[PDB]
Design a protein around this ligand. Structure first.
Ligand SMILES: O=C(N[C@H]1CCCC[C@H]1C(=O)O)c1ccc(Cl)c(Cl)c1
Length: 130
């Protein structure tokens, strides 16, 4: 839709703080911070697929909006995720061990803007078309 495409990360703010708040260890934060992933988003009726591809770690989710699913995240958390569409924004919540983090994906101009919140920490990642 607005989201379908192959996207390449062009900027990141506060991603190390974000990962540290998730409880990601130093080695994994090191690798993750200097990754420059692509994000490939596709849709086939009700099912949305989000692939993230990077030199050191690939991940893939497929989901239906409003249907909770189990996910293993890039840092190996086992979480329950639910994604919904709210005012044109794809809102993802991950829940695990009584904690949650939210990931909002929005289209702004040319770009795919991803805002990641964990407790007091807010990280913004910007992708442009590949
Ligand atoms: O799961 C990732 N990223 C997602 C989920 C949480 C942060 C926002 C979003 C993003 O990066 O836009 C992920 C996957 C592989 C790598 Cl190698 C990296 Cl570095 C990150």
């Amino acid at each position: 839709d607005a989201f379908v495409g192959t996207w390449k990360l062009v900027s990141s703010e506060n991603f190390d703080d974000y990962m540290k708040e998730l409880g990601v260890g130093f080695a994994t934060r090191k690798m993750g911070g200097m990754a420059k992933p692509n994000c490939i988003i596709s849709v086939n009726g009700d099912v949305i697929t989000i692939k993230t591809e990077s030199t050191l770690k690939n991940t893939e989710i497929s989901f239906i909006l409003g249907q909770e699913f189990d996910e293993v995240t890039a840092d190996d958390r086992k979480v329950k995720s639910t994604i919904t569409l709210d005012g044109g924004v794809l809102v993802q919540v991950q829940k695990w061990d009584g904690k949650s983090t939210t990931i909002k994906r929005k289209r702004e101009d040319d770009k795919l803007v991803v805002e990641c919140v964990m407790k007091g920490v807010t990280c913004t990642r910007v992708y442009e078309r590949a």
